[PDB]
mmCIF file of C-alpha atoms in Angstrom:
data_model
loop_
_atom_site.group_PDB
_atom_site.id
_atom_site.type_symbol
_atom_site.label_atom_id
_atom_site.label_comp_id
_atom_site.label_asym_id
_atom_site.label_seq_id
_atom_site.Cartn_x
_atom_site.Cartn_y
_atom_site.Cartn_z
ATOM 1 C CA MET A 141 -33.690 23.895 24.756
ATOM 2 C CA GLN A 142 -33.187 23.319 27.997
ATOM 3 C CA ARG A 143 -34.855 22.615 31.391
ATOM 4 C CA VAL A 144 -35.488 24.670 35.220
ATOM 5 C CA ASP A 145 -33.895 22.073 37.291
ATOM 6 C CA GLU A 146 -31.174 22.713 34.556
ATOM 7 C CA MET A 147 -30.400 26.409 34.106
ATOM 8 C CA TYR A 148 -26.906 26.513 35.795
ATOM 9 C CA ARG A 149 -25.342 24.183 34.082
ATOM 10 C CA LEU A 150 -23.863 24.975 30.611
ATOM 11 C CA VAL A 151 -22.998 21.710 28.545
ATOM 12 C CA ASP A 152 -20.076 22.835 25.740
ATOM 13 C CA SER A 153 -20.045 20.636 22.404
ATOM 14 C CA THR A 154 -16.666 20.744 20.519
ATOM 15 C CA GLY A 155 -14.548 17.945 22.943
ATOM 16 C CA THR A 156 -11.618 16.512 23.118
ATOM 17 C CA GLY A 157 -10.449 12.854 22.293
ATOM 18 C CA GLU A 158 -6.523 11.590 23.008
ATOM 19 C CA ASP A 159 -2.967 12.725 22.682
ATOM 20 C CA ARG A 160 -1.214 10.699 20.555
ATOM 21 C CA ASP A 161 1.932 9.783 22.314
ATOM 22 C CA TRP A 162 4.997 11.350 21.650
ATOM 23 C CA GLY A 163 6.572 10.785 18.804
ATOM 24 C CA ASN A 164 3.914 8.541 17.589
ATOM 25 C CA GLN A 165 4.175 9.033 13.927
ATOM 26 C CA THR A 166 7.327 10.958 12.706
ATOM 27 C CA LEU A 167 9.365 8.288 10.839
ATOM 28 C CA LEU A 168 6.734 7.266 8.213
ATOM 29 C CA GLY A 169 5.131 10.980 8.582
ATOM 30 C CA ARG A 170 8.905 11.353 6.472
ATOM 31 C CA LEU A 171 8.911 8.325 4.270
ATOM 32 C CA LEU A 172 5.145 8.635 2.845
ATOM 33 C CA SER A 173 6.204 12.499 1.645
ATOM 34 C CA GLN A 174 8.806 11.074 -0.401
ATOM 35 C CA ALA A 175 6.914 8.584 -1.753
ATOM 36 C CA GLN A 176 5.985 7.594 -5.151
ATOM 37 C CA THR A 177 2.232 6.914 -6.543
ATOM 38 C CA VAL A 178 2.372 3.965 -8.848
ATOM 39 C CA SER A 179 -0.807 2.891 -10.071
ATOM 40 C CA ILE A 180 -3.117 0.547 -8.589
ATOM 41 C CA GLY A 181 -3.444 -3.601 -9.554
ATOM 42 C CA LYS A 182 0.685 -3.384 -9.610
ATOM 43 C CA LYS A 183 1.368 -5.748 -6.369
ATOM 44 C CA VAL A 184 5.571 -5.801 -7.393
ATOM 45 C CA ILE A 185 7.090 -3.710 -8.016
ATOM 46 C CA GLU A 186 11.085 -4.668 -9.246
ATOM 47 C CA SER A 187 12.853 -2.524 -8.621
ATOM 48 C CA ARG A 188 16.491 -2.680 -11.392
ATOM 49 C CA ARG A 189 20.235 -1.878 -9.449
ATOM 50 C CA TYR A 190 23.700 -2.349 -12.134
ATOM 51 C CA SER A 191 26.914 -1.851 -11.397
ATOM 52 C CA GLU A 192 29.659 -0.315 -11.818
ATOM 53 C CA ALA A 193 32.419 -0.188 -14.358
ATOM 54 C CA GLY A 194 35.192 0.764 -16.246
ATOM 55 C CA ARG A 195 39.051 -0.536 -16.740
ATOM 56 C CA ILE A 196 41.067 3.045 -17.570
ATOM 57 C CA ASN A 197 44.933 2.750 -18.491
ATOM 58 C CA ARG A 198 46.845 5.383 -17.549
ATOM 59 C CA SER A 199 49.868 6.684 -20.544
ATOM 60 C CA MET A 200 52.283 9.210 -21.895
ATOM 61 C CA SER A 201 51.691 9.567 -25.370
ATOM 62 C CA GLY A 202 47.754 8.244 -24.972
ATOM 63 C CA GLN A 203 47.747 5.674 -27.439
ATOM 64 C CA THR A 204 47.351 2.510 -25.822
ATOM 65 C CA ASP A 205 44.281 1.264 -27.370
ATOM 66 C CA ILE A 206 41.838 2.003 -24.990
ATOM 67 C CA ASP A 207 39.469 -0.275 -23.215
ATOM 68 C CA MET A 208 35.438 0.217 -22.544
ATOM 69 C CA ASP A 209 32.670 -1.902 -20.257
ATOM 70 C CA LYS A 210 29.268 -1.955 -19.601
ATOM 71 C CA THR A 211 27.177 -2.722 -17.044
ATOM 72 C CA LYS A 212 25.302 -6.194 -14.782
ATOM 73 C CA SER A 213 21.897 -5.730 -13.584
ATOM 74 C CA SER A 214 19.366 -7.955 -10.770
ATOM 75 C CA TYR A 215 16.020 -6.932 -9.664
ATOM 76 C CA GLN A 216 15.318 -6.055 -6.126
ATOM 77 C CA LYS A 217 11.003 -6.225 -5.623
ATOM 78 C CA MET A 218 8.208 -4.787 -2.733
ATOM 79 C CA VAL A 219 5.531 -5.400 -2.359
ATOM 80 C CA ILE A 220 1.739 -3.219 -2.678
ATOM 81 C CA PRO A 221 -0.455 -4.698 0.358
ATOM 82 C CA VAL A 222 -4.310 -2.271 0.657
ATOM 83 C CA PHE A 223 -5.784 -1.067 4.632
ATOM 84 C CA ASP A 224 -8.804 -0.644 5.152
ATOM 85 C CA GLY A 225 -11.926 0.930 8.065
ATOM 86 C CA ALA A 226 -15.333 1.356 8.761
ATOM 87 C CA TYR A 227 -17.438 3.170 11.151
ATOM 88 C CA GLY A 228 -21.306 3.887 11.701
ATOM 89 C CA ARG A 229 -24.033 4.126 13.610
ATOM 90 C CA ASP A 230 -28.194 3.483 13.257
ATOM 91 C CA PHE A 231 -30.415 5.215 11.547
ATOM 92 C CA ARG A 232 -32.951 6.445 15.410
ATOM 93 C CA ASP A 233 -29.873 7.992 16.638
ATOM 94 C CA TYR A 234 -28.190 9.881 14.501
ATOM 95 C CA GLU A 235 -31.533 11.543 13.382
ATOM 96 C CA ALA A 236 -31.491 12.064 17.292
ATOM 97 C CA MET A 237 -28.181 13.503 17.944
ATOM 98 C CA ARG A 238 -28.966 15.372 14.706
ATOM 99 C CA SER A 239 -31.535 17.556 16.028
ATOM 100 C CA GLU A 240 -28.313 19.914 18.013
ATOM 101 C CA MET A 241 -25.651 19.815 15.104
ATOM 102 C CA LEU A 242 -23.217 17.800 17.030
ATOM 103 C CA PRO A 243 -20.010 17.286 15.290
ATOM 104 C CA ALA A 244 -19.624 13.494 15.628
ATOM 105 C CA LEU A 245 -19.065 12.402 11.893
ATOM 106 C CA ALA A 246 -15.025 15.243 12.656
ATOM 107 C CA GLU A 247 -15.584 13.071 16.287
ATOM 108 C CA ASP A 248 -14.906 9.431 14.324
ATOM 109 C CA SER A 249 -13.399 10.120 11.208
ATOM 110 C CA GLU A 250 -10.431 12.366 12.472
ATOM 111 C CA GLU A 251 -10.650 8.759 15.853
ATOM 112 C CA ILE A 252 -10.499 5.425 12.939
ATOM 113 C CA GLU A 253 -8.294 7.538 10.296
ATOM 114 C CA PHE A 254 -5.348 7.711 12.882
ATOM 115 C CA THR A 255 -5.903 4.198 13.973
ATOM 116 C CA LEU A 256 -6.098 2.953 10.373
ATOM 117 C CA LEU A 257 -2.330 4.467 9.874
ATOM 118 C CA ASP A 258 -2.108 3.073 13.681
ATOM 119 C CA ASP A 259 -1.692 -0.510 12.398
ATOM 120 C CA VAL A 260 0.388 0.763 8.835
ATOM 121 C CA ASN A 261 2.990 2.262 11.950
ATOM 122 C CA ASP A 262 2.316 -1.051 13.119
ATOM 123 C CA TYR A 263 3.084 -2.924 10.558
ATOM 124 C CA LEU A 264 6.441 -0.383 9.095
ATOM 125 C CA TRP A 265 8.426 -2.280 11.705
ATOM 126 C CA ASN A 266 6.731 -5.600 12.954
ATOM 127 C CA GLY A 267 5.047 -5.999 9.700
ATOM 128 C CA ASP A 268 2.991 -9.269 9.170
ATOM 129 C CA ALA A 269 3.715 -12.405 6.998
ATOM 130 C CA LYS A 270 0.881 -13.371 5.352
ATOM 131 C CA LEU A 271 0.978 -11.558 2.208
ATOM 132 C CA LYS A 272 3.726 -12.766 -0.329
ATOM 133 C CA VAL A 273 3.127 -12.891 -3.806
ATOM 134 C CA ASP A 274 6.444 -14.565 -4.360
ATOM 135 C CA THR A 275 9.719 -14.064 -2.143
ATOM 136 C CA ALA A 276 7.821 -10.300 -1.828
ATOM 137 C CA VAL A 277 7.507 -10.550 1.825
ATOM 138 C CA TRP A 278 8.697 -8.181 3.842
ATOM 139 C CA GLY A 279 8.470 -8.592 7.964
ATOM 140 C CA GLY A 280 8.997 -5.866 9.574
ATOM 141 C CA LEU A 281 12.187 -3.229 10.279
ATOM 142 C CA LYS A 282 13.063 -5.689 13.101
ATOM 143 C CA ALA A 283 13.275 -9.263 11.706
ATOM 144 C CA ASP A 284 13.814 -8.085 8.416
ATOM 145 C CA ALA A 285 16.386 -10.070 6.250
ATOM 146 C CA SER A 286 17.128 -6.158 4.480
ATOM 147 C CA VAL A 287 18.217 -5.033 8.097
ATOM 148 C CA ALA A 288 21.242 -5.343 9.425
ATOM 149 C CA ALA A 289 21.240 -6.134 12.808
ATOM 150 C CA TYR A 290 24.038 -4.875 15.432
ATOM 151 C CA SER A 291 23.439 -6.192 19.145
ATOM 152 C CA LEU A 292 24.340 -2.558 21.705
ATOM 153 C CA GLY A 293 26.504 -3.476 24.411
ATOM 154 C CA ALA A 294 26.205 -1.163 27.054
ATOM 155 C CA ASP A 295 22.435 0.191 28.241
ATOM 156 C CA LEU A 296 21.787 3.578 26.823
ATOM 157 C CA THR A 297 18.875 3.771 29.557
ATOM 158 C CA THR A 298 21.872 3.901 32.474
ATOM 159 C CA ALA A 299 25.415 4.463 30.432
ATOM 160 C CA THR A 300 26.543 7.896 30.829
ATOM 161 C CA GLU A 301 27.976 10.584 28.476
ATOM 162 C CA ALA A 302 30.991 9.240 27.434
ATOM 163 C CA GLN A 303 29.506 5.990 26.534
ATOM 164 C CA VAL A 304 27.432 6.973 24.688
ATOM 165 C CA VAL A 305 29.739 8.449 21.536
ATOM 166 C CA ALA A 306 31.707 5.551 22.622
ATOM 167 C CA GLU A 307 28.411 2.724 21.469
ATOM 168 C CA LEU A 308 27.219 5.120 18.780
ATOM 169 C CA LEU A 309 29.497 5.035 16.707
ATOM 170 C CA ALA A 310 30.014 1.319 16.451
ATOM 171 C CA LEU A 311 26.226 1.989 15.331
ATOM 172 C CA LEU A 312 27.486 4.179 12.812
ATOM 173 C CA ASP A 313 30.745 2.282 11.617
ATOM 174 C CA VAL A 314 27.600 -0.785 9.618
ATOM 175 C CA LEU A 315 27.191 1.740 7.343
ATOM 176 C CA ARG A 316 29.714 3.453 6.979
ATOM 177 C CA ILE A 317 32.777 0.821 6.846
ATOM 178 C CA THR A 318 31.075 -3.354 6.580
ATOM 179 C CA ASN A 319 27.949 -1.529 4.461
ATOM 180 C CA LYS A 320 30.592 0.814 2.452
ATOM 181 C CA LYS A 321 26.818 2.825 2.598
ATOM 182 C CA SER A 322 27.277 6.912 2.473
ATOM 183 C CA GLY A 323 25.330 9.751 2.493
ATOM 184 C CA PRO A 324 23.245 11.658 5.358
ATOM 185 C CA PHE A 325 21.784 9.348 7.452
ATOM 186 C CA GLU A 326 19.571 9.679 11.144
ATOM 187 C CA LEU A 327 18.320 8.248 13.377
ATOM 188 C CA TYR A 328 15.549 6.940 15.967
ATOM 189 C CA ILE A 329 15.677 6.404 19.339
ATOM 190 C CA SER A 330 13.600 4.865 22.039
ATOM 191 C CA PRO A 331 11.638 6.935 24.521
ATOM 192 C CA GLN A 332 13.860 5.206 27.247
ATOM 193 C CA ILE A 333 16.346 6.377 25.954
ATOM 194 C CA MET A 334 15.756 9.804 25.191
ATOM 195 C CA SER A 335 14.465 10.260 28.567
ATOM 196 C CA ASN A 336 17.955 9.126 29.585
ATOM 197 C CA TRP A 337 20.424 11.289 27.146
ATOM 198 C CA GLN A 338 18.797 13.978 28.890
ATOM 199 C CA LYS A 339 19.366 12.395 32.144
ATOM 200 C CA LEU A 340 22.168 13.112 32.181
ATOM 201 C CA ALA A 341 25.028 14.546 29.600
ATOM 202 C CA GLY A 342 23.158 17.711 28.532
ATOM 203 C CA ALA A 343 21.902 20.242 31.486
ATOM 204 C CA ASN A 344 24.114 18.716 33.856
ATOM 205 C CA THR A 345 27.503 19.699 31.825
ATOM 206 C CA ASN A 346 26.953 22.435 29.426
ATOM 207 C CA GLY A 347 23.695 21.729 27.806
ATOM 208 C CA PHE A 348 24.444 23.516 24.940
ATOM 209 C CA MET A 349 21.654 21.999 22.078
ATOM 210 C CA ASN A 350 22.086 18.149 23.143
ATOM 211 C CA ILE A 351 19.111 17.479 19.764
ATOM 212 C CA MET A 352 21.373 19.315 17.605
ATOM 213 C CA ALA A 353 24.494 19.309 19.186
ATOM 214 C CA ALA A 354 24.630 16.204 17.094
ATOM 215 C CA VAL A 355 23.140 17.708 13.650
ATOM 216 C CA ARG A 356 25.001 20.873 12.292
ATOM 217 C CA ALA A 357 27.885 21.174 14.735
ATOM 218 C CA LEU A 358 29.918 18.479 15.552
ATOM 219 C CA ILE A 359 27.970 15.197 13.125
ATOM 220 C CA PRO A 360 26.319 16.791 10.060
ATOM 221 C CA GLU A 361 25.634 13.246 8.947
ATOM 222 C CA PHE A 362 23.351 12.854 12.081
ATOM 223 C CA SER A 363 20.065 14.825 9.765
ATOM 224 C CA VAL A 364 17.799 14.256 12.705
ATOM 225 C CA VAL A 365 17.548 11.752 15.915
ATOM 226 C CA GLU A 366 14.519 11.834 17.194
ATOM 227 C CA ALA A 367 12.588 9.071 19.576
ATOM 228 C CA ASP A 368 10.139 6.705 18.608
ATOM 229 C CA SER A 369 7.381 5.153 20.325
ATOM 230 C CA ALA A 370 7.149 1.894 17.976
ATOM 231 C CA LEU A 371 11.235 0.652 19.580
ATOM 232 C CA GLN A 372 10.048 0.319 23.647
ATOM 233 C CA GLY A 373 13.984 0.491 25.385
ATOM 234 C CA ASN A 374 16.857 0.304 24.709
ATOM 235 C CA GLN A 375 16.625 -0.371 21.260
ATOM 236 C CA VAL A 376 17.940 2.706 18.758
ATOM 237 C CA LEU A 377 17.875 2.801 14.300
ATOM 238 C CA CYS A 378 19.705 4.626 12.146
ATOM 239 C CA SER A 379 19.669 4.339 8.638
ATOM 240 C CA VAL A 380 19.487 6.669 5.282
ATOM 241 C CA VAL A 381 16.298 8.193 3.945
ATOM 242 C CA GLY A 382 15.405 8.085 0.576
ATOM 243 C CA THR A 383 14.619 6.698 -2.852
ATOM 244 C CA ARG A 384 18.310 5.207 -2.168
ATOM 245 C CA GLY A 385 17.637 3.527 0.772
ATOM 246 C CA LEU A 386 14.398 3.245 3.590
ATOM 247 C CA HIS A 387 12.344 4.323 0.941
ATOM 248 C CA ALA A 388 7.965 3.578 0.361
ATOM 249 C CA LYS A 389 5.718 3.693 -3.068
ATOM 250 C CA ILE A 390 2.363 4.541 -1.743
ATOM 251 C CA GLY A 391 -0.841 2.185 -4.504
ATOM 252 C CA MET A 392 -3.544 4.127 -3.323
ATOM 253 C CA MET A 393 -3.544 7.749 -0.901
ATOM 254 C CA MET A 394 -5.984 7.539 1.769
ATOM 255 C CA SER A 395 -9.375 8.264 0.633
ATOM 256 C CA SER A 396 -12.998 7.718 1.586
ATOM 257 C CA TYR A 397 -16.514 7.475 1.139
ATOM 258 C CA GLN A 398 -21.017 7.064 1.892
ATOM 259 C CA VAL A 399 -22.003 3.587 1.595
ATOM 260 C CA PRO A 400 -25.418 5.567 0.289
ATOM 261 C CA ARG A 401 -29.187 5.100 1.715
ATOM 262 C CA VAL A 402 -31.833 2.568 0.018
ATOM 263 C CA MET A 403 -34.032 2.205 2.686
ATOM 264 C CA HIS A 404 -35.245 4.923 5.026
ATOM 265 C CA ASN A 405 -34.159 2.563 7.436
ATOM 266 C CA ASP A 406 -30.674 2.035 6.082
ATOM 267 C CA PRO A 407 -27.847 2.138 8.510
ATOM 268 C CA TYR A 408 -24.989 5.775 8.323
ATOM 269 C CA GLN A 409 -21.668 4.056 7.077
ATOM 270 C CA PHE A 410 -18.392 5.255 5.915
ATOM 271 C CA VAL A 411 -15.227 3.595 4.674
ATOM 272 C CA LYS A 412 -11.591 4.541 4.710
ATOM 273 C CA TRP A 413 -8.911 2.510 2.149
ATOM 274 C CA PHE A 414 -5.568 2.728 2.386
ATOM 275 C CA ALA A 415 -2.967 1.011 0.091
ATOM 276 C CA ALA A 416 0.953 1.644 0.152
ATOM 277 C CA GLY A 417 4.833 -0.944 0.890
ATOM 278 C CA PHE A 418 8.022 -0.587 2.410
ATOM 279 C CA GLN A 419 11.264 -1.524 1.162
ATOM 280 C CA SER A 420 14.625 -0.667 1.776
ATOM 281 C CA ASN A 421 17.418 -0.418 -0.781
ATOM 282 C CA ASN A 422 20.214 -3.756 -1.234
ATOM 283 C CA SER A 423 22.694 -1.980 -3.658
ATOM 284 C CA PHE A 424 24.186 -5.165 -6.815
ATOM 285 C CA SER A 425 27.252 -5.970 -4.660
ATOM 286 C CA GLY A 426 24.535 -7.131 -1.768
ATOM 287 C CA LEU A 427 25.068 -4.089 0.307
ATOM 288 C CA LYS A 428 21.968 -4.015 3.846
ATOM 289 C CA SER A 429 22.039 0.861 3.943
ATOM 290 C CA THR A 430 20.423 0.015 8.061
ATOM 291 C CA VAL A 431 20.895 -1.232 11.002
ATOM 292 C CA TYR A 432 18.681 -2.161 13.383
ATOM 293 C CA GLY A 433 19.923 -0.820 17.483
ATOM 294 C CA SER A 434 19.020 -4.671 19.853
ATOM 295 C CA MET B 865 7.247 -2.469 -18.864
ATOM 296 C CA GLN B 866 9.641 -5.281 -19.908
ATOM 297 C CA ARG B 867 12.184 -6.025 -17.822
ATOM 298 C CA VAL B 868 15.790 -6.187 -18.200
ATOM 299 C CA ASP B 869 16.348 -9.784 -18.559
ATOM 300 C CA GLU B 870 14.650 -10.410 -20.548
ATOM 301 C CA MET B 871 13.425 -7.572 -22.562
ATOM 302 C CA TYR B 872 13.324 -9.372 -26.554
ATOM 303 C CA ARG B 873 9.404 -10.802 -26.724
ATOM 304 C CA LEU B 874 7.193 -8.115 -28.896
ATOM 305 C CA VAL B 875 4.108 -9.115 -26.616
ATOM 306 C CA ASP B 876 1.143 -8.112 -28.554
ATOM 307 C CA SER B 877 -2.558 -7.481 -27.456
ATOM 308 C CA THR B 878 -4.728 -8.013 -30.227
ATOM 309 C CA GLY B 879 -6.322 -11.147 -29.212
ATOM 310 C CA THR B 880 -6.813 -12.755 -33.541
ATOM 311 C CA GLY B 881 -10.343 -13.796 -32.026
ATOM 312 C CA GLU B 882 -12.576 -17.520 -32.687
ATOM 313 C CA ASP B 883 -13.556 -18.352 -35.601
ATOM 314 C CA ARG B 884 -17.175 -19.445 -36.475
ATOM 315 C CA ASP B 885 -18.574 -22.304 -37.970
ATOM 316 C CA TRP B 886 -19.984 -22.782 -41.195
ATOM 317 C CA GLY B 887 -23.571 -23.359 -40.450
ATOM 318 C CA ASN B 888 -23.774 -22.683 -37.434
ATOM 319 C CA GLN B 889 -27.360 -20.727 -37.548
ATOM 320 C CA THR B 890 -28.039 -20.520 -40.734
ATOM 321 C CA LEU B 891 -31.806 -21.799 -40.038
ATOM 322 C CA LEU B 892 -32.538 -20.129 -36.364
ATOM 323 C CA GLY B 893 -30.604 -16.919 -38.979
ATOM 324 C CA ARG B 894 -34.398 -16.532 -40.394
ATOM 325 C CA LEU B 895 -36.662 -17.164 -37.469
ATOM 326 C CA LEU B 896 -35.984 -14.726 -35.692
ATOM 327 C CA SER B 897 -35.489 -11.987 -38.770
ATOM 328 C CA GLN B 898 -39.197 -12.789 -39.733
ATOM 329 C CA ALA B 899 -40.212 -13.247 -35.657
ATOM 330 C CA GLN B 900 -43.501 -11.231 -34.795
ATOM 331 C CA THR B 901 -42.806 -9.571 -31.275
ATOM 332 C CA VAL B 902 -45.259 -10.016 -27.732
ATOM 333 C CA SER B 903 -45.241 -8.311 -25.099
ATOM 334 C CA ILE B 904 -43.391 -9.680 -22.402
ATOM 335 C CA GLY B 905 -45.671 -11.955 -19.772
ATOM 336 C CA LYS B 906 -47.710 -13.168 -22.636
ATOM 337 C CA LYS B 907 -46.549 -16.837 -21.742
ATOM 338 C CA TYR C 1077 -9.826 -5.358 -13.853
ATOM 339 C CA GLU C 1078 -8.113 -1.847 -12.573
ATOM 340 C CA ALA C 1079 -4.701 -4.121 -13.365
ATOM 341 C CA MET C 1080 -5.470 -4.734 -17.271
ATOM 342 C CA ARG C 1081 -6.764 -1.263 -17.560
ATOM 343 C CA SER C 1082 -2.992 0.140 -16.957
ATOM 344 C CA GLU C 1083 -2.366 -2.204 -20.556
ATOM 345 C CA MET C 1084 -4.920 -1.496 -22.086
ATOM 346 C CA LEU C 1085 -5.885 -5.122 -22.619
ATOM 347 C CA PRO C 1086 -10.300 -4.934 -23.581
ATOM 348 C CA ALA C 1087 -11.309 -8.591 -21.110
ATOM 349 C CA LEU C 1088 -14.539 -7.142 -20.856
ATOM 350 C CA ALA C 1089 -14.976 -6.011 -24.357
ATOM 351 C CA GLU C 1090 -13.789 -9.914 -25.313
ATOM 352 C CA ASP C 1091 -16.811 -11.152 -23.098
ATOM 353 C CA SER C 1092 -19.846 -9.322 -25.309
ATOM 354 C CA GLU C 1093 -19.011 -10.546 -28.149
ATOM 355 C CA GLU C 1094 -18.666 -13.813 -26.632
ATOM 356 C CA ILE C 1095 -21.883 -14.407 -24.265
ATOM 357 C CA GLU C 1096 -24.184 -13.765 -27.551
ATOM 358 C CA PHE C 1097 -22.203 -15.609 -29.297
ATOM 359 C CA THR C 1098 -23.535 -17.976 -26.396
ATOM 360 C CA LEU C 1099 -27.184 -17.058 -25.815
ATOM 361 C CA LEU C 1100 -28.256 -16.909 -29.639
ATOM 362 C CA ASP C 1101 -26.504 -20.955 -29.146
ATOM 363 C CA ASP C 1102 -28.411 -21.953 -26.231
ATOM 364 C CA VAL C 1103 -31.906 -20.347 -27.586
ATOM 365 C CA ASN C 1104 -30.735 -22.670 -31.311
ATOM 366 C CA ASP C 1105 -30.047 -25.721 -28.959
ATOM 367 C CA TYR C 1106 -33.227 -24.752 -27.886
ATOM 368 C CA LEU C 1107 -34.317 -24.860 -31.079
ATOM 369 C CA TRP C 1108 -33.375 -28.493 -32.223
ATOM 370 C CA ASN C 1109 -33.726 -30.485 -28.817
ATOM 371 C CA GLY C 1110 -37.074 -28.605 -26.827
ATOM 372 C CA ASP C 1111 -36.570 -29.169 -22.738
ATOM 373 C CA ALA C 1112 -39.777 -30.445 -21.478
ATOM 374 C CA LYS C 1113 -38.769 -28.927 -17.797
ATOM 375 C CA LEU C 1114 -40.889 -25.537 -19.621
ATOM 376 C CA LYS C 1115 -44.924 -26.271 -20.101
ATOM 377 C CA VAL C 1116 -47.925 -24.039 -19.320
ATOM 378 C CA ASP C 1117 -50.593 -26.459 -19.412
ATOM 379 C CA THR C 1118 -50.461 -28.774 -22.519
ATOM 380 C CA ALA C 1119 -47.955 -26.285 -24.666
ATOM 381 C CA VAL C 1120 -44.785 -28.156 -24.315
ATOM 382 C CA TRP C 1121 -41.772 -27.833 -28.050
ATOM 383 C CA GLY C 1122 -39.544 -31.505 -27.445
ATOM 384 C CA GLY C 1123 -37.999 -30.312 -30.030
ATOM 385 C CA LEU C 1124 -37.703 -30.241 -34.001
ATOM 386 C CA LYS C 1125 -36.679 -34.104 -33.895
ATOM 387 C CA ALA C 1126 -38.839 -35.063 -31.396
ATOM 388 C CA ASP C 1127 -41.989 -33.515 -31.804
#
């Protein structure tokens, strides 16, 4: 199985690919775990958003002609596109490489499925304007008209401890004040800011769990404060996740199959495909729910 | 189904076909019922 | 077809009984009008009104 000029060598299989990134798919890992599954073929998923209602009247005797109301409705639509990818080798090669039982499939179906989601991760933030049915474009999490744009004033990579919280509340008040939203939020940072917010203001002034110092002690509304590599530099994003905010709907879950071989020299080929879509929730009264910082 | 803006249309999915003619294939219906079956390839 | 399978709308079933009608219609156009383009040695058909 070896030569006699190569008995000192001990080439070992089961290598390693590449380490992913620092915070690669943290947001998409949360959306696709809370997603609703619809049937394939439904290209547009129009959802209903009713209003609030009710006129009341106070009295001491209680008989003052109780008076009635109902709710109106309007609709907001999304879109479901399909992603796909494939890989394959020839006939003389794979029969040569199979004689040593090398797991060459498991070092390929994990490095194509990973870049399959890595294009879905591009569609989440910089979504293409090539997929439009009637008016249901997506546009991306940093260019959409369903995302509140807020310009930061102070650079969060060089600022002190005091200017961070003074310019993080001015971001959160585009969800509590001018957009009336409530409930559990979360916050997504670029890694250059999180390398600054731990450079100073943490391990230099008392420490005490700076990730979780604004999670369950001071700000219970900020549920998760994590980094994300899709934001690069001085940019952050705060929003709600769940069915009342930023949500995703899966058309077809990620499946894979093999193109069957007919002749004796048909090359080996495999196909992976996937289909889902994204939309951020608007209310009936026109109250947005996601803020993208700068 | 049935967006609540409309919700007033019982849309049915039967089809109600398409009718034949009266005397469409009367001759060919008699020839192909008395036909002899030969093997394919015999031109 | 995967969309029309959801609403249980038959659409291939409205084609099996619409080609089989048309297939027995252009074998009816060969009886009454023939085809000169199918000739082996001398065995044309020509049609029931020109033979």
